[PDB]
Amino acid sequence: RKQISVRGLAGVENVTELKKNFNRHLHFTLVKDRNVATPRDYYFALAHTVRDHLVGRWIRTQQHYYEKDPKRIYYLSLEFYMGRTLQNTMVNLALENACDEATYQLGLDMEELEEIEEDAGLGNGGLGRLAACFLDSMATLGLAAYGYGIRYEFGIFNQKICGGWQMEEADDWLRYGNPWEKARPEFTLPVHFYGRVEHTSQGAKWVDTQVVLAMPYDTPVPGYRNNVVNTMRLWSAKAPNDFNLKDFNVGGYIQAVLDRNLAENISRVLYPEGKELRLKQEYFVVAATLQDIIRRFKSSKFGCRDPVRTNFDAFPDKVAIQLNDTHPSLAIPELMRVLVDLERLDWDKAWEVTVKTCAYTNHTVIPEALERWPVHLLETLLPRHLQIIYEINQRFLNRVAAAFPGDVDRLRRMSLVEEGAVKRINMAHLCIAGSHAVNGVARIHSEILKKTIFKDFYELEPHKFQNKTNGITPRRWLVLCNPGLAEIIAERIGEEYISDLDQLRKLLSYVDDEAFIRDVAKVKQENKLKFAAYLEREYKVHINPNSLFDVQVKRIHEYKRQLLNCLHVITLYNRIKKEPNKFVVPRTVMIGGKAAPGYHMAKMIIKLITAIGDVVNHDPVVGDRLRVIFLENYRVSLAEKVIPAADLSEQISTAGTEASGTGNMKFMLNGALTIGTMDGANVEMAEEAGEENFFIFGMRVEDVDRLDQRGYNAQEYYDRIPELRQIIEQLSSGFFSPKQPDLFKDIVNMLMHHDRFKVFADYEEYVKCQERVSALYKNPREWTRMVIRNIATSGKFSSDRTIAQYAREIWGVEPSRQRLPAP
Amino acid sequence: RKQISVRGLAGVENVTELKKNFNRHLHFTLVKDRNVATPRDYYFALAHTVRDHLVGRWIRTQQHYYEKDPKRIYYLSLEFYMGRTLQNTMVNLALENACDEATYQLGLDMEELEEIEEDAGLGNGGLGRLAACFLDSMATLGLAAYGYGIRYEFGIFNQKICGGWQMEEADDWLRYGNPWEKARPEFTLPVHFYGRVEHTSQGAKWVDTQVVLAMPYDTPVPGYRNNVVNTMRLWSAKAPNDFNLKDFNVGGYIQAVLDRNLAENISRVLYPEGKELRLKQEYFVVAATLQDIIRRFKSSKFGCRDPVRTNFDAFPDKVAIQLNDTHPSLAIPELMRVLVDLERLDWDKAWEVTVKTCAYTNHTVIPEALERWPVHLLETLLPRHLQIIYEINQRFLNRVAAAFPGDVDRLRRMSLVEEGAVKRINMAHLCIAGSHAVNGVARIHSEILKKTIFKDFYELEPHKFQNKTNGITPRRWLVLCNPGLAEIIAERIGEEYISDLDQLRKLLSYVDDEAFIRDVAKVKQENKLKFAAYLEREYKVHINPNSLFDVQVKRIHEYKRQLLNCLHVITLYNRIKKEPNKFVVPRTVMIGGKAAPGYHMAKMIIKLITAIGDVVNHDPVVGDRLRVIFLENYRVSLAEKVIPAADLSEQISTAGTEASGTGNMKFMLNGALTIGTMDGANVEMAEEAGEENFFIFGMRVEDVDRLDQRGYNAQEYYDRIPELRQIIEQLSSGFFSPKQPDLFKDIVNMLMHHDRFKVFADYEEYVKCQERVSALYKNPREWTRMVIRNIATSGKFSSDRTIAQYAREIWGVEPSRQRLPAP
Numbered sequence A, B: 001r002k003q004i005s006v007r008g009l010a011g012v013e014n015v016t017e018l019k020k021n022f023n024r025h026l027h028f029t030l031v032k033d034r035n036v037a038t039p040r041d042y043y044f045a046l047a048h049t050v051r052d053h054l055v056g057r058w059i060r061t062q063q064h065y066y067e068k069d070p071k072r073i074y075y076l077s078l079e080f081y082m083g084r085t086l087q088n089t090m091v092n093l094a095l096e097n098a099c100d101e102a103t104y105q106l107g108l109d110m111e112e113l114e115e116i117e118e119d120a121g122l123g124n125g126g127l128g129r130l131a132a133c134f135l136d137s138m139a140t141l142g143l144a145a146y147g148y149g150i151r152y153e154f155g156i157f158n159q160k161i162c163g164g165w166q167m168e169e170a171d172d173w174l175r176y177g178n179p180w181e182k183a184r185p186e187f188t189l190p191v192h193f194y195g196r197v198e199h200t201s202q203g204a205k206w207v208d209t210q211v212v213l214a215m216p217y218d219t220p221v222p223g224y225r226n227n228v229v230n231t232m233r234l235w236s237a238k239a240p241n242d243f244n245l246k247d248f249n250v251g252g253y254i255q256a257v258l259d260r261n262l263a264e265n266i267s268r269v270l271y272p273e274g275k276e277l278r279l280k281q282e283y284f285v286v287a288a289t290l291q292d293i294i295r296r297f298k299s300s301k302f303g304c305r306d307p308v309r310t311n312f313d314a315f316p317d318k319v320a321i322q323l324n325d326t327h328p329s330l331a332i333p334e335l336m337r338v339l340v341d342l343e344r345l346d347w348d349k350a351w352e353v354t355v356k357t358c359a360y361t362n363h364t365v366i367p368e369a370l371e372r373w374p375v376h377l378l379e380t381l382l383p384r385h386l387q388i389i390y391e392i393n394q395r396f397l398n399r400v401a402a403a404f405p406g407d408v409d410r411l412r413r414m415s416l417v418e419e420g421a422v423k424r425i426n427m428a429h430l431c432i433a434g435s436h437a438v439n440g441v442a443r444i445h446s447e448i449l450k451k452t453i454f455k456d457f458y459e460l461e462p463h464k465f466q467n468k469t470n471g472i473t474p475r476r477w478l479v480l481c482n483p484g485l486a487e488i489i490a491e492r493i494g495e496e497y498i499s500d501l502d503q504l505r506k507l508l509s510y511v512d513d514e515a516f517i518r519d520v521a522k523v524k525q526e527n528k529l530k531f532a533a534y535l536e537r538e539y540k541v542h543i544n545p546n547s548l549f550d551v552q553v554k555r556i557h558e559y560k561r562q563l564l565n566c567l568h569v570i571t572l573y574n575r576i577k578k579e580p581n582k583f584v585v586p587r588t589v590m591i592g593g594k595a596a597p598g599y600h601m602a603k604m605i606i607k608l609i610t611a612i613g614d615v616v617n618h619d620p621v622v623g624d625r626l627r628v629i630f631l632e633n634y635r636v637s638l639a640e641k642v643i644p645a646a647d648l649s650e651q652i653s654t655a656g657t658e659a660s661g662t663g664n665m666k667f668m669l670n671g672a673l674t675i676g677t678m679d680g681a682n683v684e685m686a687e688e689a690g691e692e693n694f695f696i697f698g699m700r701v702e703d704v705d706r707l708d709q710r711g712y713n714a715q716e717y718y719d720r721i722p723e724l725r726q727i728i729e730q731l732s733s734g735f736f737s738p739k740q741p742d743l744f745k746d747i748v749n750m751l752m753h754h755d756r757f758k759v760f761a762d763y764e765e766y767v768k769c770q771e772r773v774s775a776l777y778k779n780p781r782e783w784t785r786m787v788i789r790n791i792a793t794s795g796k797f798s799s800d801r802t803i804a805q806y807a808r809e810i811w812g813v814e815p816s817r818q819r820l821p822a823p
Ligand SMILES: Nc1ncnc2c1ncn2[C@@H]1O[C@H](COP(=O)(O)O)[C@@H](O)[C@H]1O
Pocket: A058, A059, A060, A062, A063, A064, A066, A296, B031, B032, B033, B035, B036
């Protein structure tokens, strides 16, 4: 009977057993054959050849956690922007070299097959690109960690630039399956909605609820070469399917067609304000996921080690729930509904355990953006929960009162219930009330979380508030995407560095060396060529490989400032034009990002970018000195390509608007010099790299605050700054739009008359700051020289570090660089 | 690339290797582990170790067929009562033994695992077992045959008796997945619907349609020990899901949630009338299947052997289409459709092909059941197909007029358009006009086919009419469900009988060797014993293994006659009670059937046996001399159980009603005597066996037609017989009802006043025949020698015969029982 084991069925590295398991998977798993198989089959055969390995490990790893009994740290997040798992599972799992050999024999090119893979559409942006690094670093630093989210079938829309206009093409990545997940019908749990609270003798009962079924999908995550593979668990909604007659509800009328569908689309789609479905999604994921946690808590050796009712008395010791942005906050009242209505812990016992079990990483800098739901929305689909949210609140305000008697305005400033045109619930005030630690995500950002935005709460409980600066994984953002540059670097100092990133600091020691100079600039050369090429096979252009590579690949939005960036390109265009032969450096200026559907200004801004695009790039006198490029359907595996070929990172937001910034870091480590303003974490990048080593410019927060105070008038800059005057008049004449000259009319007025973000305010400095970079480009030695200084600096930006810190101050778990044994 | 082979994954009989592979599937496929695996997970581990051995073979067979390029025979049928695939994958592959040594060692009882598997809920009755049966033999006699039907998600209902009442529960057999099927998302086809035939220049176009997509699953089907595994490909309907934006349809209104849901349920469930669902199911599977059929055609080197059109002239030579019943009849206007509209064959050529290519099989005894669809549905949804059923009709009544110049009534009798209040297409007439073979399913059924229902069709084309007689398969129905009798038989005459069951005649030589006489009977007593255990362990009662186990397991219906069998179990009961003391040959009557949703009489007859039971079964005076049990939810996995264990075979239909009856044949092979009326398959069975070895009885057909001519006054029968007068007043005063006495009224009155099937006429001679049934039982030597004279004579009843008659006479290929190497 123990006879059934993991101990002999993967003979791992051998390029013989790898051909064996591939050919096995192609024929028997995939129930296909070489006379029929397409690239996509051979790719699936390869993904299972690498997947057999991963679950060897994963069964061992998990089983390990059941004996050792660690604190389980459950990351809740409604986005998980992973994006391709073949290559990453090969470099982390060691297997990279063997896979290339097996396919080489087999007559298949491995690289052909990895670009076959669809970006795991489970995330949309950085809140979920973050969560993803957090998942790989946690497992690398051997913590019994677990990511939890919803499965999205349709991800989040795909971008298509039709007519140089944005059409969101749909992304059902999943319509051929996913060789890395494993459905689990066996662990299908109810998520309840609507219903009615009866108050009954031993508390209450939440009766006549509608029910939707949550059904899980484990996908496993390897850690860099240490054999710990942990469990990402995504849920899917599947309706009750009694739908024909069961309950004698149907028959009468099949408006249950709508139960089936509405419920079924709690999994269908990631969002891109108020909606019963966003909130449906948010109750869904956290009900299900808490049902799981109570279950490994009750059984993981605790059906054994009960002493106290397999009690939650020891729940915060053993289990750790982390809230990523406000979207999971319903974990706080659900655990309080679960703990008191379902078991029976007295209210206080329950709360003690909630505040001890949770934490909340904040990603919002401006307070209008904190999630807040209508009480008539809460009281309709989550009735018991609104009761719980009202009682927590009450108790919080009694505690505020003991601590500040008579500051009556405090009581209403701090409440969970917000009065107004519509009485609301403020979800961040729920989390701070309900976690034992609140951390922001940037030096600067957690400061203002203390000083202005959460200050009353920071005054009532100063302990709670912490910092935990955002970082990249060195694996995906340094080795996968920048292989040779990982190489030349390891040469000089070891292999501990991809798992101990500030050792990059030893490269300091090479700043003047004309070897690591041509070295580093060689891998960058390689990189800019591979990327030179992709652009006219996937998509078509005419680069000049020599040129500056001005990259900005950010969510398209007003505060992010691709508008000033195009103003500079129009400036340059016209400068190359009026001075037809003037030696200036070249710059391939590429802006990439998806808009946000039915947001007119971001849809227009891309129209600007792909309007300049035709004009200047089909101007003769430009030739190859100026190039503008919109990167269509910019996503994680397009980051990995393009960040490698970056020279100049653009980081132009308005100061005070970014709460951190992760694409930022990614450019610094791949030897991409940042331009940018003093915001979010473009600041700590400066604290190590050195202010000189960084093109930090324009307004800081003070001057915007001071310009908001003295009234900002855009006309006044237009009338002084002379090439500005010129290019706005160009935009209105319909220079960049002969067929509808009128077309860009609203970008003009936006700027001219009503701009919140002060683009023109930082124009002036920007053209002269960008002139600093184009003296320096063409001082190639010193150019590279600052690029090395940059990389050695990168180290504090590894998720390794952030997890290690979340590990140490909040979670209460020590990191670990040990390799687990086995297969 | 040729290194991508089937060659090396073949440990086959190696128990060492089979255990290593159960293990790979539990840890790396199912991604589960011994700490957390359940019995189900162990079943699914085993379903996969074997599937390696199935699909390895299917790859070699399918390649084979394209290397050789055989005529391929397509069997479209809407029903495939597949019923449980593991032990039957194992015995046709010889792995039965090595799987139990490998699981013995791993500490898992194989029969346990075996009972975890759900029946393939792919069917409903006689017609779906016969399809699967033919299928198994199509494979053993080397036919390049495919099975094509509809994949029901939720089957047909599971039958559950509530207090005596049939409540239908549902059969979502697919609730945990199905290991044998691989879904083929890659091969999605559209089926068109509604739309509008727009006519132009060359020909017509069906424009503006609704499109549903048919998505296929493949399940390999293994022929006994010859290593040929063929294909059953079921289609699952799936709505296009651009419904969210595309078309611009939704946004305006998502009442399109209905398209999706009406589309989905072309597959959501089987039937149990003039439903557009029914008709959308029948058409679905036809449009879907003919696409793969012209696809394989145009591929299977018929690109190569084009010479003229990739000529559909040569199409019947490499294709065959079998319309098992009226249901795939749209296969004839649809093959025409593709051929004249899409290709551009002229009508006459195409008709030559659709006629040389289809072959109808009929299962009816009577005129009334023939499928007939109102023109207004064919015109609503299937507009182009209505126009071709009309030119086909139009041309046909010309051949008929030319050949019967002047008989007008024959033209209105052969018409494919039934006339009256509502205008129908008689879909059986279609099939005879497009097929080139029309065939019964028994000698007399085929006879009333050329003498009554289609005699004018028999007069216009005598050559098309055939007979082919149903058969069981000795692999499932003897080897698999009763290895015991199959062991005592295999020693005396050899294993060669399983592929050639007329070698069972040799058993006659041992009629008087008294070892076999007690061997045969040892097995039946062991069988009945095993099943008596089931009756106390999946549900319960108090059995007696020695009693005459009497069985009837047919659908519950008035003509199939279990109410006769009730009146006789209540005759017999009364007798144990007038004189308790007179020994009476004890019986355990078991009647089991699924009634039919919303058939009141059938719902009523079941509630009688679960009543007749409660009374006699509890009454002390009986002991265990007679008991009654209704078998809950008859289905192939129970038939494999109860048919082994039966003595009596209740084949009591009214004479003239039944056309063949596969059930009949299952009983004989498993050594059970038959009691029954001289209808359909009681005829040929009694003929190979001798009427002395059979318990034929009752109103012959002649007899019934006389009683009909004089008017069956049932009352007179009531008034001559006392033991009946007795049991009639019994029901009515409420003896078997008592809490609601009047409860059986509509049965008493049915019987007395409107019994279409003359249940009282066959009372007398039947209960007398049962008195001579119980005589023999009380003489086991001779009982078992009439059982030897029975088993030995089954031969004619293997489906390998029926299929051979079919390969050779209709499809036009010769069988092959040859071993194909593999793997
Ligand atoms: N009681 C247990 N003892 C050992 N390993 C276990 C146990 N329960 C679960 N596991 C392992 O942990 C994995 C995750 O378990 P679960 O927490 O049930 O999702 C399983 O796939 C097993 O590999």
